[PDB]
């Protein structure tokens, strides 16, 4: 089909000249003669019937003049119920060594976004079981959740815990898109779900599909794996009227990969160094990941915050695309509170007394206010001394510290790290416990009793153990 | 050899097209028709039988079409014993008006670095008589020594002190390479060495050769004079097999000259604006300045830090090429402590307890520790006051300040500035004095008594004098 | 976001032109350009891809003109011209309270006052989070 | 006598601390202005270099 020839191989950007009709942009080009499959996606019509293409795999071995065919369609991936329990690449190739993925329906990774009249206006609440999330920044069923955080702050652990708590319980299928992450973590997740039962290698009851492009992959591949995963999720939303859970790790890699190829594509660098087409491409991806009126897709996306700078363009743009945001602060993790959710930075759209209820809203706002007042008091402490503050100031500091400790919750996925058994706190118990702490009913209990506990019943019980060991 | 017509002249970059036989890269092309020799160094084979060259002198008066004749070899300089006592320029021409340098052998400016199997591993302590250096950052014999400092912090004063304390006693020869420094400094050093006898204008008893590429020179020349001094040092290291002391001034100027010509050489600017080949060219130059198994070269290179900023690419890259590093700080000079060596930044590779000695190592580490703790308490002091400190903390502050004062030492080359006679302190006295100060034996003495003194005995004498 | 960059660039002008109808016919109107920063980002994307020479933060030099030829259309016409009004409420998202950034500086210079909101006040119980000190009305 | 002396000393010490803080913030503001201008210049230079290389 209009067999082209490679005219230049610079980095991942390969230019092909088509003597016959030029392939339209975003179509997939297959390089002939390579032992494996190398797919070149058209990016620009440079001119003189030449297309600038970004390779989806390594460009080593390419020789000028090599024949390149045109598929005629954007990269098409095997999609359907048969992808569950299978690991697939960006170009939809089985990488689990379990044979070909035999799906009767193929879909292209590139597609238009859902229309405005297809947007749903409902806002439910998803009880993850995490005290910080459910109280301060409640997640919503179908909403777009964002796990903002730096490096080594808890994004991967938190997302795996969310998979364990929600996805396992959720009857609908789930999709995990490992965009630009460590390959070791991908294998860990694959093995963990095998033993957990979410992926069954024997039967056909698997409930989670895996799309992985790790950082070992070339920049081009790392910029489309998210599109492949969301295409699979879209199939599980439109073709099948089911609720889906799309878990993507480090969406930031989607933006970063574009920055690694924009210069070769021929674009003038934008601020800091990202590609000029940052917001547009990010929206094109994100708008597709929504809950239409046909079906719901509750998406949890981990977003790496470069150098813990939220003002960085990549995390900054993604804030507008997410209904519920949970920012993991390194300073809190240094304090030891795990999860390291920043109580005064995390926000959710359903945090509305009409939606979450008056009591829930009041308790959450009280917690946030007391923590703000504690932040204010710390500056005074640094100069005056703790033994100089007023009794009201000391009471506020004590209660705020107790609340901060009670925010910490041991995770089942973190049982290996912390050593404590994982706990899941119901929303009612979370609200009741934080309300009691705000009231002061547990002021007599030491702060240590509130650290790494589940419900306040565990909190008071721990205090008694310490007294018995005193 | 081959005649080429000048096609383009931009700054120090001369574009010459050769009709036949393109001169190989790094060859010396001589311009024909100029009053003084203007040698061009082939930098890039641009193509179309055209070679882009870097000029080693002014390009004023050059016309498009002027003939340039290849020499067939890289820029060569007179090398040998006759060079001792003589001043040379980048191209090797004598600039001391004493006559031509009649050396039996001539060596090329550019040469390959000593190979891995020729490197030496011996490390010995070169006592300099300076308290800060000898105690915290001992200088290694035959190792590359770097003096980091900003504008007007004491780099050239310190290097003059090293010349006075070491080069005079050194049994071998020495080479002082002046790269991008004020010419009056060179004239002073030349006459000072003549007076001292290091440069004898009567008989061949001179022990130091001078190569000068001062800031008046064009950028191309300043980027190669260091290589000239390195070559004349290399001859003594290898052929004569004699230990040499290569004192270079502001190696930074070598990098700065490269940045000025890199723009005209058609290269995409790197960070800040330096050349994209900063690390490679700096390594190529530095790697040649190394002690080999044939001979030893103790290299004292002064490195200017732009804007007193050590994260600048030029000073930052130089750190990897130095065994001993001395970082002078402006703030220390502001307080008055001279030399302005930063106690907690200067480092050395012979500061090993199995090399420098356990006692010396312990003393140095303890001094660094107490100064670090004082730095850690600086903020609390600056806001609250020393009153809001533990009496133990006050002891650390009081002792640390005495150490900082005692680090200062009158310098022989600074007698004409401060009015105080220089004090060359032996290493043992420095170690013992800092032991005594750390222990607390001289806590009663005022801190001022430790400022600008030699051995601790002078400190106690000054303390009594302060009656 | 899915809409192409030119559409985001033209949206504020289209809305202002729609508003001008009321102002030019003696009817009072209010327009709220939410995220005028995003319009500047779209204009930057268009300009840089069009190879228009860059500037500070890669924003094209005429971004001030882009915002000024939009906010100045807001006016209170006199009685002879109908007496209509087109109130404008642009929204600019500062990053960590950087009111000295390119687009914030431009919009602040153009506008007749600002209503600064601080996240500290929002979590301190002060909702709305209007900082009375910084907020000013010419 | 002690209480009056203590209060007077505390007032003086707090005043001195405020003065020291004022000097420090003046120096830090100068540094901040320099660094901000440098950052803007550096990003400008990076963008220009990227444009010219194209």
């Amino acid at each position: 089909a209009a067999t082209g020839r490679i005219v230049a191989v610079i980095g991942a950007v390969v230019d092909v000249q088509f003597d016959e009709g030029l392939p339209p942009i975003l179509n997939a080009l297959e390089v002939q003669g390579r032992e494996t499959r190398l797919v070149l996606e058209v990016a620009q019509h440079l001119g003189e019937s030449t297309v600038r293409t970004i390779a989806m795999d390594g460009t080593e071995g390419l020789v000028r003049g090599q024949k390149v065919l045109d598929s005629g369609a954007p990269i098409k991936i095997p999609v359907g119920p048969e992808t569950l329990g299978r690991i697939m690449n960006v170009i939809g190739e089985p990488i689990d060594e379990r044979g070909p993925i035999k799906t009767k329906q193929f879909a292209a990774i590139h597609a238009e976004a859902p229309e405005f009249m297809e947007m749903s206006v409902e806002q439910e609440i998803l009880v993850t079981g995490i005290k910080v999330v459910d109280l301060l920044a409640p997640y919503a069923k179908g909403g777009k959740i964002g796990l903002f955080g730096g490096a080594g702050v808890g994004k991967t652990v938190l997302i795996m815990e969310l998979i364990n708590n929600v996805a396992k319980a959720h009857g609908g299928y789930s999709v995990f898109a490992g965009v630009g992450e460590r390959t070791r973590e991908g294998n860990d997740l694959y093995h963990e779900m095998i033993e957990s039962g979410v992926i069954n290698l024997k039967d056909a009851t698997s409930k989670v599909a895996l799309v992985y492009g790790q950082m070992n992959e070339p920049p081009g591949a790392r910029a489309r794996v998210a599109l492949t995963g969301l295409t699979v999720a879209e199939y599980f939303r439109d073709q099948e009227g089911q609720d889906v859970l799309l878990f993507i790790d480090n969406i930031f890699r989607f933006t970063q990969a574009g920055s690694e190829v924009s210069a070769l594509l021929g674009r003038i660098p934008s601020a800091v160094g990202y590609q000029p087409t940052l917001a547009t491409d990010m929206g094109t991806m994100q708008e597709r990941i929504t809950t239409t009126k046909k079906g719901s897709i509750t998406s949890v996306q981990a977003i790496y915050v470069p150098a813990d700078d939220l003002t960085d363009p990549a995390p900054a743009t993604t804030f507008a695309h997410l209904d519920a945001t949970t920012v993991l602060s390194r300073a809190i993790a240094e304090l030891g509170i795990y999860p390291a959710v920043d109580p005064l930075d995390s926000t959710s759209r359903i945090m509305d007394p009409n939606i979450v209820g008056s009591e829930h809203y009041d308790v959450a706002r009280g917690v946030q206010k007391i923590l703000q007042d504690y932040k204010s008091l710390q500056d005074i402490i640094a100069i005056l001394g703790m033994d100089e503050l007023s009794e009201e100031d000391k009471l506020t500091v004590s209660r705020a510290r107790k609340i901060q400790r009670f925010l910490s919750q041991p995770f089942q996925v973190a049982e290996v790290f912390t050593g404590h058994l994982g706990k899941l706190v119901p929303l009612k118990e979370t609200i009741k416990g934080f309300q009691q702490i705000l009231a002061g009913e547990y002021d007599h209990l030491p702060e240590q009793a509130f650290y790494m506990v589940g419900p306040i019943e565990e909190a008071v019980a721990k205090a008694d153990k310490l007294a018995e060991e005193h | 050899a081959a005649t080429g017509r000048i096609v383009a002249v931009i700054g120090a970059v001369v574009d010459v097209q050769f009709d036949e036989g393109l001169p190989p890269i790094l060859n010396a092309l001589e311009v024909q028709g100029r009053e003084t020799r203007l040698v061009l160094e082939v930098a890039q084979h641009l193509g179309e039988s055209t070679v882009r060259t870097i000029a080693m002198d002014g390009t004023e008066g050059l016309v498009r079409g002027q003939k340039v004749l290849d020499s067939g070899a890289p820029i060569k300089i007179p090398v040998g014993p006759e060079t001792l006592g003589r001043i040379m320029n980048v191209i090797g021409e004598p600039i001391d008006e004493r006559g031509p340098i009649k050396t039996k052998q001539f060596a090329a400016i550019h040469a390959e670095a000593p190979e891995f199997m020729e490197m030496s591993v011996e490390q010995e302590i070169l006592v300099t008589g300076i308290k800060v250096v000898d105690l915290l950052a001992p200088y290694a014999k035959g190792g590359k020594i770097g003096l980091f400092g900003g504008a007007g912090v004491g780099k050239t004063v310190l290097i003059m002190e090293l010349i006075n304390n070491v080069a005079k006693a050194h049994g071998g020869y020495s080479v002082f390479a002046g790269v991008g420094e004020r010419t009056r400094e060179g004239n002073d050093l030349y006459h000072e060495m003549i007076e001292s006898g290091v440069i004898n204008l009567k008989d061949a008893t001179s022990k130091v050769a001078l190569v000068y590429g001062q800031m008046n020179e064009p950028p191309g020349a300043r980027a190669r004079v260091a290589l000239t001094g390195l070559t004349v040092a290399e001859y003594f290291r290898d052929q004569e097999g004699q230990d040499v002391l290569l004192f270079i001034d502001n190696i930074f100027r070598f990098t700065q000259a490269g940045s000025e010509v890199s723009a005209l050489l058609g290269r995409i600017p790197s960070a800040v604006g330096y050349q994209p080949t900063l690390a490679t060219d700096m390594g190529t130059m530095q790697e040649r300045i190394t002690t080999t198994k044939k001979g030893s070269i103790t290299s004292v290179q002064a490195i200017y830090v732009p804007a007193d900023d050590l994260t600048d690419p030029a000073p930052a890259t130089t750190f990897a090429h130095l065994d001993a590093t001395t970082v002078l700080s402006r703030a220390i000079a502001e307080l008055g402590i001279y030399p302005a060596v930063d106690p907690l930044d200067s480092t050395s590779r012979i500061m090993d307890p199995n090399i420098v000695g356990s006692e010396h190592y312990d003393v140095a580490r303890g001094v660094q520790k107490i100064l670090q703790d004082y730095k850690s308490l600086q903020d609390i002091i600056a806001i609250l006051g020393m009153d809001e400190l533990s009496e133990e903390d006050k002891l650390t502050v009081s002792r640390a300040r005495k150490i900082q004062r005692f680090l200062s030492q009158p310098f022989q080359v600074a007698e004409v500035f401060t009015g105080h006679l220089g004090k060359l302190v032996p290493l043992k006295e420095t170690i013992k004095g800092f032991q005594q100060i750390l222990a607390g034996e001289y806590d009663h003495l005022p801190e001022q008594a430790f400022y600008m003194v030699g051995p601790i005995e002078e400190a106690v004498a000054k303390a009594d004098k302060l009656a | 976001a899915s809409d192409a960059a030119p559409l985001q660039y033209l949206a504020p002008y289209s809305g202002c032109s729609m508003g001008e109808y009321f102002r030019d016919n003696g009817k009072h109107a209010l327009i709220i350009y939410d995220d005028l920063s995003k319009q500047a980002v779209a204009y930057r994307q268009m300009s840089l891809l069009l190879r228009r020479p860059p500037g500070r933060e890669a924003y094209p030099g005429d971004v001030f003109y882009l915002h000024s030829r939009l906010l100045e259309r807001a006016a209170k016409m006199n009685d002879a011209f109908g007496g209509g009004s087109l109130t404008a409420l642009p929204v600019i998202e500062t990053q960590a309270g950087d009111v000295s950034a390119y687009i914030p500086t431009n919009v602040i210079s153009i506008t007749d006052g600002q209503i600064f909101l601080e996240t500290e006040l929002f979590y301190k119980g002060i909702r709305p989070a209007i900082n009375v000190g910084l907020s000013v009305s010419r | 006598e002690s209480t009056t002396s203590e209060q007077s000393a505390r007032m003086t010490a707090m005043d001195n601390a405020s003065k020291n803080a004022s000097e420090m913030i003046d120096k830090l503001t100068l540094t901040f202005n320099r660094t901000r201008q440098a950052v803007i210049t550096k990003e400008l230079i990076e963008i220009i270099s990227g444009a010219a290389a194209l």
């Binding site: 703000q372 932040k375 500056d379 402490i381 640094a382 | 850690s376 600086q378 609390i380 | 600064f116 910084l134 | -």
Partner: peptide
């Protein structure tokens, strides 16, 4: 006053991570 001037916020002492922040933490 003028918005352009750098504005401090609650917790800055601890956020800095300097000696005063550490003193507050330990205290």
């Amino acid at each position: 006053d003028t918005p352009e001037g750098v504005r401090s916020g609650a917790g800055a002492v601890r956020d800095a991570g300097g000696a005063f922040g550490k003193k507050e933490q330990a205290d």
